Amino acid sequence: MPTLFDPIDFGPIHAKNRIVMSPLTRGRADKEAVPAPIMAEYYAQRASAGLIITEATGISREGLGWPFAPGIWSDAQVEAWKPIVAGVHAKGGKIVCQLWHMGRMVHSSVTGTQPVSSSATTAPGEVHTYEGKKPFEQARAIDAADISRILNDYENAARNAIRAGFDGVQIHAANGYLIDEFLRNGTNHRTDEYGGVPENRIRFLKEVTERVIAAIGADRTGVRLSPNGDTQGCIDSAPETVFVPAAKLLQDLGVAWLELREPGPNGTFGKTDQPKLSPQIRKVFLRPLVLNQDYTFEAAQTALAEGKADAIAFGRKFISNPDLPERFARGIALQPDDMKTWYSQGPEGYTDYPSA
Ligand SMILES: Cc1cc2nc3c(=O)[nH]c(=O)nc-3n(C[C@H](O)[C@H](O)[C@H](O)COP(=O)(O)O)c2cc1C
Numbered sequence: 427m428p429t430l431f432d433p434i435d436f437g438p439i440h441a442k443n444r445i446v447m448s449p450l451t452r453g454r455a456d457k458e459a460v461p462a463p464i465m466a467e468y469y470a471q472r473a474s475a476g477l478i479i480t481e482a483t484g485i486s487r488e489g490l491g492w493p494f495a496p497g498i499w500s501d502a503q504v505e506a507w508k509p510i511v512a513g514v515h516a517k518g519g520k521i522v523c524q525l526w527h528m529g530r531m532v533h534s535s536v537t538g539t540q541p542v543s544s545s546a547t548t549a550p551g552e553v554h555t556y557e558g559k560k561p562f563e564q565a566r567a568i569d570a571a572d573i574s575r576i577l578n579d580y581e582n583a584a585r586n587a588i589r590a591g592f593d594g595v596q597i598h599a600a601n602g603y604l605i606d607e608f609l610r611n612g613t614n615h616r617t618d619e620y621g622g623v624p625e626n627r628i629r630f631l632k633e634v635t636e637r638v639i640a641a642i643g644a645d646r647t648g649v650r651l652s653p654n655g656d657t658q659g660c661i662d663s664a665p666e667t668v669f670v671p672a673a674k675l676l677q678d679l680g681v682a683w684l685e686l687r688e689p690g691p692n693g694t695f696g697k698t699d700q701p702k703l704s705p706q707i708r709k710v711f712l713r714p715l716v717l718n719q720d721y722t723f724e725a726a727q728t729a730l731a732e733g734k735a736d737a738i739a740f741g742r743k744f745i746s747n748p749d750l751p752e753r754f755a756r757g758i759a760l761q762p763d764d765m766k767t768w769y770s771q772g773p774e775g776y777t778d779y780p781s782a
Pocket of ligand 1: 601695719
């Protein structure tokens with residue numbers, strides 16, 4: 427019954443439509459992870475999205491490896507995010523901060539410390555640094571003092587997001603970052619209460635989510651999961667046995683909304699033959715369910731008509747179509763995105779894609 431053009435409530439967040447801007451790392455902050463003024467223009471250009479999910483935003487230096495990505499642990503960062511968020515609100519938009527701990531996906535040259543993870547494992551390929559790509563480093567398996575600290579960092583980051591004026595947060599529990607490295611049995615080789623059976627592998631997600639909810643409210647908390655397909659060396663051998671229970675826990679804790687990134691067999695941002703778990707998750711998580719990856723306008727419209735999702739998040743289309751909702755409403759061709767400038771430092775390929 428819903429179309430992409432119909433409004434939706436994400437908890438108390440009143441979105442004007444169901445065309446979500448997915449989280450996109452762009453690397454237009456400074457080397458100190460403080461947002462830069464150009465980011466205000468980039469997000470204001472995209473304020474017609476029913477909801478913007480920010481680029482992944484580091485909760486701590488330990489968890490933030492991506493060159494020129496922002497953080498939200500410090501008041502300098504909070505003060506720089508304030509005008510960015512204000513410019514979206516002034517255009518009638520809504521925006522949530524995606525809270526990031528990268529886990530084993532960082533390089534020590536950026537963070538100053540060894541990568542941390544569920545287990546002492548190594549991501550495949552090479553990692554981005556300020557001196558170019560380097561081999562990934564084997565992580566260290568976090569202990570109870572580290573868990574306490576990391577929970578504190580999620581708590582503080584969530585508080586700071588609200589302090590900056592964000593409408594809410596999304597916990598980044600996807601794409602082979604720290605939480606995902608606990609969830610999936612390909613990365614989690616722990617012997618303690620955080621390893622082994624699915625309820626143990628969900629425990630870290632549970633504790634992060636509980637601490638964010640206690641800080642800012644369940645109704646202001648969303649989560650992203652990526653249940654299916656290897657992403658950055660992280661895969662589960664039987665994802666339904668951990669991700670359907672994870673989604674149910676989130677439902678029971680009061681989490682306001684859930685986004686699933688789901689590659690398919692012919693996916694163009696990763697691909698996989700692991701089946702998509704959205705149909706099973708839709709039956710256990712009953713609040714707004716946002717799906718993502720490879721959606722066209724007609725596939726998205728059909729998903730909402732068939733009750734498969736309440737909203738769809740678009741990533742690459744929002745890179746090059748700041749006015750994606752208007753282009754869809756008006757049948758205007760979608761401008762191609764320039765992959766060479768996804769992660770570069772310029773305004774080129776960032777704030778210089780025109781609106782219709
Ligand atoms: C340049 C770029 C940066 C991205 N950064 C993030 C990110 O910060 N957080 C995240 O959860 N996903 C990130 N993603 C994944 C997207 O949110 C999205 O899942 C992906 O682009 C597929 O959806 P699409 O087919 O609509 O583009 C990124 C994708 C791209 C292309």
